[model samples]
Target: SPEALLKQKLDMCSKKGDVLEALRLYDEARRNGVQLSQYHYNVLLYVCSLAEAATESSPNPGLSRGFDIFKQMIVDKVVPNEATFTNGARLAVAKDDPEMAFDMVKQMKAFGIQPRLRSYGPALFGFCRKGDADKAYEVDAHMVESEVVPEEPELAALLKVSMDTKNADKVYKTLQRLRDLVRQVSKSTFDMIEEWFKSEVATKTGVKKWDVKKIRDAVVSGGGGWHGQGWLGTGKWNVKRTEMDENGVCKCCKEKLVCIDINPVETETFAASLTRLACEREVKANFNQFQEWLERHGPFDAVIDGANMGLVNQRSFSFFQLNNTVQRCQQISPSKRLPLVILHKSRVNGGPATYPKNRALLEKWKNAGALYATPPGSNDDWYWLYAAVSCKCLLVTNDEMRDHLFQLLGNSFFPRWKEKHQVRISVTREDGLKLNMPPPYSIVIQESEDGTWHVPMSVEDDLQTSRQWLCAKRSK
Candidate 1:
């Protein structure tokens, strides 16, 4: 009970970030013969880590105290967990001993404690800050082997170190890795990329000549994504900071980047996966019947979220707005087919739906095979989302699809799918019905066949607004 009270006090100090108080309490506990648990030791270590970050002129007392606590933790044979190891690593980094920090991370496995990205951060970033590129690379490799994915900060540090060393190949590889891991890069990472491209070494790295035809073919084969064979040209890179046009054409180069999307095989696989998930989560027969119905009278070019359309810029559900959206989508569709509208059964049978004009509109949609009213207790998201994916068509909605239901589709491919396929809409009094089409190009790092690189930066959250990009191309 006294140990619990001591732990409670230590936790309070941890929360308050009071390292000295925690150390004093630890001393008192030891004097009272209070055996500290792993939790209590970890709390003290965490508190010390916080104080280690102070802007004091002299070395923070917390750093030395943290090491002492760690050594004592080992002596007590109170086994360290992930947090303990991470705190120990942090203290090592604070003492300018990244090697020791890295070794501690490796020792995590000896204690059967799997290291997380945070556990590796102290050593990897410490080496990076010290301009020890090779050491950082080693830490990065260790992380990869351990199956820990690096986030933006970690990759940015690697990029910086690689660029500082003028290791063009490593820089290229790091950029590619950043592209794969991050969709929207932070401003700091974007600045680092810009700096690297502008450097004289960047001008000297690539080949003087290459097979243009072969590179072009490779780009085509890769679905216009990228051809990562190698840098294809030499001389000063033409680097510019610009934005994509409304149609996703680069303002700097006047080149229209291709809209990256999952291929036909991936689309089919994605549709199947969605179906499996829907069947597993939703009413089996209901979803199965929808699948069969889709097979018979589907393959629509777009799927409209009826409820979303009906409520857009309206005090109540409006069939007029819904019809306008459906017509707009049909006008843009190649075949001019009515897009399937998914609404709940309540939307079809109650409220504004009972009105004569709304009733007639519903009849029109049903006659044209454009409406599917989900039954009571069924989710309309499942229906419309599945319809769009299965048909491999556009999804018309303002919903950002960040909800729990959308999360089930997985992050990796779903974002790519949404980027190319989701059609956003806005109904304003002045603008009327405005359908913001999916961008012609993806807002991620892209390496063209001609060895040009386009790295999009996150300037804003709105998909319709153009984003600033760093475009680097070889000079002729």
Candidate 2:
């Protein structure tokens, strides 16, 4: 029964001379693998035109389909020539809608469809029917810009819209351009526009009707009443650039830059094992005087305040034992599972590296956002942790100045600041045989740094008291 209904529609289309219906059906049939003669397609195209429009059946398959079918014709390897062009576009003209047709015109260009002289007038009429004067004129502009040398009549048709749009300055400009084109075409064009302007009303409301005079004034008077033309690069929108260092921080505008300023025994490279051999010599000598580290306490999440010197003796404490233990921690997590972070003093300048060991570690470590860098004035080294808190780890260092540092840090008014946070510090023992280990949560770890690697084994608890290191000034 539906087949009969389709046949009825087909019959009605055939009777009323609706070739678009026949072509659509024929295309559908071909798409379904039901072959049709080339003559069938050609005839369908020949009969479909704006001039011979008769809507025999009206079931508009939305705009996307309208364009998609047009694309399918080419995809099927069909050289859709003049007949095909007329068939696709005439529907838009007949409906007095040229937007789709305008789009199709672009496709036609891509498909290499050259317009005949008569096509100019019809297409211009199509655009005007749709009240698209500006678009019609722009097509002409694209033509000139693309060097598509329009025929005599196409020029006149294009000028008609420019006049209707009351772009009088453009008219004068078009007039000058037409001087190189054929004769009488220019003045006749200008006069047509002038006459159209005499009776024009503004299509849009609450705005004065546009005319050649207003257009010319805007054009010659440097865009009358228009704004936002090259007015950037000056005000709040302007922005300057910045820089950083090997510490992965901005190299400028930092608040205060402090490094762990210690002098070194030497700067030569040695194997980690061989380095530990010499470090043994360091501890045996200072084992009598220094407090030591014991086991079962720690594994601090080290927040490395960057080193200025290789030895830890620049302070009132000893360096020989401190450097020895740092070398030992490296042996503990030999695979370098921890993160190495770099910190800035102020915004991004190389201040004190809060976590250089971890930064270096993570640079080479897998799963690395775990390590974090911080500026020296971290309110408190206790609260300076961005990552250690999440990891529940300790900062291993000898910080006897924690109270003074806290006093200065408390002035920052950072509510989230660790007011009196604590971490287990690891240092060497007086016996020199084992480490002097504290509870697992202290935050400072210092060992002898004068050995082959300038680091040692075990941990020290040097929070707020004066402890001397085994490193005597090398009198050599």
Candidate 3:
């Protein structure tokens, strides 16, 4: 009973971060034969670890004291948990023996304690601190295969190693991963990276001085923060199928026209695109024979007209601008909103006669999975519209039905359908991207020449509208 009581007091010391006081309590417990549990040991060991680093001649030898407390835990035959392993690994890291950190993980596993992201973090970080990219990557692979969701600290550490090694590819990958995890990085971490690049990395790496500022800007901007799905691939339904079968048909559409299964009764979400519309509907025989491409890439909050959006600048809508727009669109919901962006392959991979000078922007968008490219010679509008109608989500673009392609659908149902599903976007060079969703369709009775009354076919725009149309439509 005294041991449990003493363990409680010991915890107070750990909580207080009072290493010396904890040491005194541990000694007092031992002298009185107040037995300690693994929990108690973990507390004291972690407390000692929290102590300021010490040297051999220093008055407070916290590192050495930490090691002594850890060994004492082993002697007491107390089973260690993840915290124990993590503290021990960190202690090993302080001792500059990263291998020992991973060794702790392996041994913890022998005791049936599964290694998690926190368990592997120390070793991953220690290796990174030691500038061993190979080992760091090995631990990273382990984390990936184990599907451990990474935290910002470990990710920031990975960024450091990438910078230190002057590995451009690794740096890019690390930044992308960092962007994928959190909506915004702590300014302190971003500043540290910027400082590292400015003072330490500028000469050692091929990266330019101004480039670090750009990277820092990106980190602060926090583009592509999609929770775990960005990398875990869980957000996706894990659906896989052929684009089109030998029957020359897409299972998604079943040979139906573009705007099938859509109506005022529809409160569900769908997606569509510009490039795919032109490519699939207009020039099907010229390129890939895939219909319902959205079945593979559908199920989004909205489908974007990348060609339409991309053309805002013929050489325009810089990466930052596009990023701001996507970020704003996502603000419609708290959780990550993944809008599918369909671009013509020519947008990034210019045709023989034309080469895009600002190709770098495309890479940034592509890396985040926010951007998708249509096959060569294919139109983007068909895929865009199919995805929107199929998924039942709205389309976010500025395209009016003035084009010949939209003419094929004719003004019958499409006039209302497009208005119902379309979201018109406008970007003020000075302000930012603006989304003007169509007002909710109103109940207005129309009298035919025969004197019969019916609802008119037109989608209306209401500035007061939100994404809750489905919920509202079902309610009173």
Best by TM-score: 1
Candidate 2 overall lDDT versus native = 0.38
lDDT score of residue 62 within candidate 1? 81
lDDT of 2 at 300: 43
Local accuracy of candidate 3 as per-residue lDDT tens digits, 1-476: 79778877877776778877887888898899877888888777677666554456553566667766776666666777778877776666565556656765555555555566666876888798789988998888867866777877888788788767766557646655653343234544555444443433332333112343444454334321111111111111111111222232334323211112334443232122333445545665532344433445434677777667655544754444445556666787456676777777765676311434346656655665556777775656776776676666778767665778776653334555675678876666797668776544321211111111111111223232211110000000
Candidate 2, residues 257-339, lDDT tens digits: the string is: 11221112211111222223323443433321211220222234443332311224445322233334444444444464342
Strongest candidate by lDDT: 1
| Model 2: residue 316 alpha-carbon error in angstroms | 99
For candidate 1, lDDT tens digit of each residue in 336-398? 999999988788888757778877888788778888878888878889988888787899988
TM-score of each candidate? 0.76, 0.32, 0.36
User: Backbone collision count in every prediction?
Assistant: 0, 62, 38
Cα lDDT listed for each candidate: 0.82, 0.38, 0.56
Worst 10 residues of 3 by lDDT: 467-476
RMSD per candidate (Å) reads 4.8, 30.7, 25.3
